[PDB]
Amino acid sequence: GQMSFTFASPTQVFFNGANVRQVDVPTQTGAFGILASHVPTLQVLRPGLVVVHAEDGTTSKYFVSSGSVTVNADSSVQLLAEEAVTLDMLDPGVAKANLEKAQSELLGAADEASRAEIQIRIEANEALVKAL
Amino acid sequence: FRSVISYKTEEKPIFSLDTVASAESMSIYDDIDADVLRNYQEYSLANIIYYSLK
Amino acid sequence: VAYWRQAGLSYIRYSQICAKAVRDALKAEFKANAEKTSGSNVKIVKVK
Amino acid sequence: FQFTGIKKYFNSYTLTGRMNCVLATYGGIALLVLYFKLRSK
Amino acid sequence: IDTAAKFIGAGAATVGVAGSGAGIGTVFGSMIIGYARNPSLKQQLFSYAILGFALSEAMGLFCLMVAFLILF
Amino acid sequence: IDTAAKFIGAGAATVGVAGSGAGIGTVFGSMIIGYARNPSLKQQLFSYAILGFALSEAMGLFCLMVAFLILF
Amino acid sequence: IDTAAKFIGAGAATVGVAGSGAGIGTVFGSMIIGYARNPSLKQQLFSYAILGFALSEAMGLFCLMVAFLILF
Amino acid sequence: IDTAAKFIGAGAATVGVAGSGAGIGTVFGSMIIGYARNPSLKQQLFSYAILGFALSEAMGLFCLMVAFLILF
Amino acid sequence: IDTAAKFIGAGAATVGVAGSGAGIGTVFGSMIIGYARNPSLKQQLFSYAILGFALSEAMGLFCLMVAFLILF
Amino acid sequence: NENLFASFIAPTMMGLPIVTLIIMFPSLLFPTPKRLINNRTISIQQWLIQLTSKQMMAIHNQKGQTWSLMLMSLIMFIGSTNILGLLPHSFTPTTQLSMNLGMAIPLWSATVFTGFRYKTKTSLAHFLPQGTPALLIPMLVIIETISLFIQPVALAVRLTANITAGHLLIHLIGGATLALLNINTMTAFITFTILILLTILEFAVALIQAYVFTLLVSLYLHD
């Protein structure tokens, strides 16, 4: 109650000043739930789906890629994300194939930071399939 | 810019350093460490440039 | 701290890769909006 | 016909599963101490 | 020998009923760290404590009948 | 002579439950701080409260099994 | 032989209150981390520790009253 | 034998301070991990950890007070 | 019979030194996790551990001190 | 001095009547149909298997999946023979400690001989955990082998000891009702304690998950 939820891509805007009681965000260092007066933090995101529960009967299943959640002192949040798409624009069939090919290059990485780049890529496709 | 006719050259600061962003107004805030604030303060540098570019 | 930490990376270098994978899992219809953003146009000039 | 319904199963896993001899030896020795204590009452 | 045997079986049983006090230290105490992250107070949050508070006391008042089972 | 030894061997056997009087105090205090972070209680988080409860009461009550056998 | 039972009984019955203090340190050791995460002291958080000290000591101080009736 | 009942009770009631010994070890295990998240030290972070100590050790010290009455 | 009450008071009183040995595992466990947030360690972060370690062991030695009184 | 509890002193008898009828009887509670659509009482037995066959399948994911079609027969037998005995005067075969020492050892030693017929070296080179430090080799391989041979005793004795522990509190709380010809208010509260305790004694289904599963972990780890 008496909240404000803002959800904006760089090119488009989903929510402006319209809050619905509960926001689920995948944090880099875990996960959290927003329930009308959460103790404010400054967190950053991991690849994972955002399921905003509208009042409105049902929920809203978005899927962010990397953004920033700023819940602040007054009861108002500002969730800004870079690639915030829904579910139906994605195809599951291409997401299955992209996993094991990046696992195949993981053994074939000679350097230490180039292999660390491969570990970033397999994590994002892992949250891709399990969200589907 | 304000309108079609009149614009204005403006000024906005960038708190890029983590420790100047470590003051009295952040001790009220939650479990953010110097690694989380390192990742977050970088991302707001890319959001002030995209604001400036538009 | 993670594997992209302590190896010498930045969070933009993290955020470039995980957002690029979402633009590869899109369909043929919404591939143009992945071509729309595609922000590789700024050149690099350092004097040395 | 309580055999050929499950005969393909038996020689698959009774190679390790039908080792009740250790149960038979740990059983048969467990017979011995109880007849012995009633012998000495 | 009769009243000698009864009472030191009764006192040594009542040690176990303060053995569940150390649980409701955690039950009533770990409500604090949950309430500060999220103030959804009259939700199942305080009511899950009652499922903790009276089930951990249910091992506390468990042995107390067993002590009075050997009082008589 | 062993009539008291019937008692204290039962009277000492009962305080071995005093672990599990606190051991379920952990798992209910540790659930509300697993819940206030993430309000999805109808999922497997509550199902790990009861299996943790039942596996702790499985090691709870059978300490009182050795109590009655020393008596009866 | 009555005197040899009354004095071992109450001293056995005092053992459990060690369980009470070992949880009652947690109910202020969660309020230290409670207030240091969200300064909500004067509201409902501190009053829970007032309930938290009052509750678990009632599991404790009754066990001392068990020791008195063995002594008396 | 009459003096023997004096000796057996206090060594049993001695152990009721063992848990209250660890019941002050955790209230300092909080203020390490409490202060390291909000440097508001000289204010009511430290002033509360003073109160949790002297309350809990007093309930351990009263357990030593009954050890003297069993002794005397 | 006069020697036997010396050793129960020796054996049962020494038990309580176990509890404070459990407490200093907490405070030295908590200094490892408090440092991993905020490396201000050589300041009052580490100094609060040696505050707490001396205060818990003072209770456990206070338990052990009655073992030398009641034996002698 | 208001409410004086009573007790009755009577021997609690785990006798041994004719067992080989009582073992066969929870087989005929489950029928098997030779038809496509079934008859709405097997059909909720057939669904109940297709749940918990999808949880002892998912972990293994090998060619050790052949073993798993047996492990769902092991869950229905002691799932049934622990649930039949809650009735008024019935008799459970998993009360006696005899057969459980014949359920552990022919199954537990079927696991250590599974990798020893295929791997022959690295099955019990799982005794080597990590990148070996020097001061604790003898302190380790006398510990991790004494916690191997405990496992057959650890698997059987945990089942017999708490199943029978349910039956005594059924009697003793129940028998204190019968001998409560003192004040009649407290009779109901002991009865209400019983009908809560009989709900807790449908954790005799919950204690069969903790027998098939720590048989899987004791199979998945070795193989």
Short mmCIF file of N, CA and C in Angstrom, two decimals, chain B residues 28-31, chain G residues 36-39:
data_model
loop_
_atom_site.label_atom_id
_atom_site.label_comp_id
_atom_site.label_asym_id
_atom_site.label_seq_id
_atom_site.Cartn_x
_atom_site.Cartn_y
_atom_site.Cartn_z
N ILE B 28 22.03 4.35 6.54
CA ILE B 28 20.63 4.00 6.72
C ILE B 28 20.25 2.83 5.82
N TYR B 29 20.86 2.73 4.64
CA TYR B 29 20.52 1.71 3.66
C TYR B 29 21.00 0.33 4.11
N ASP B 30 20.64 -0.67 3.30
CA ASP B 30 20.76 -2.08 3.64
C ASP B 30 22.14 -2.66 3.33
N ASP B 31 22.19 -3.98 3.15
CA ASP B 31 23.37 -4.84 3.12
C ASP B 31 24.34 -4.63 1.96
N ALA G 36 20.23 -2.84 13.43
CA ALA G 36 21.36 -2.37 12.64
C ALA G 36 21.12 -2.54 11.15
N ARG G 37 19.95 -3.08 10.80
CA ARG G 37 19.55 -3.30 9.41
C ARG G 37 18.40 -2.39 8.95
N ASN G 38 17.68 -1.81 9.91
CA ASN G 38 16.55 -0.94 9.67
C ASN G 38 16.20 -0.30 11.01
N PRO G 39 16.52 0.97 11.21
CA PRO G 39 16.23 1.62 12.52
C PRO G 39 14.74 1.79 12.80
#
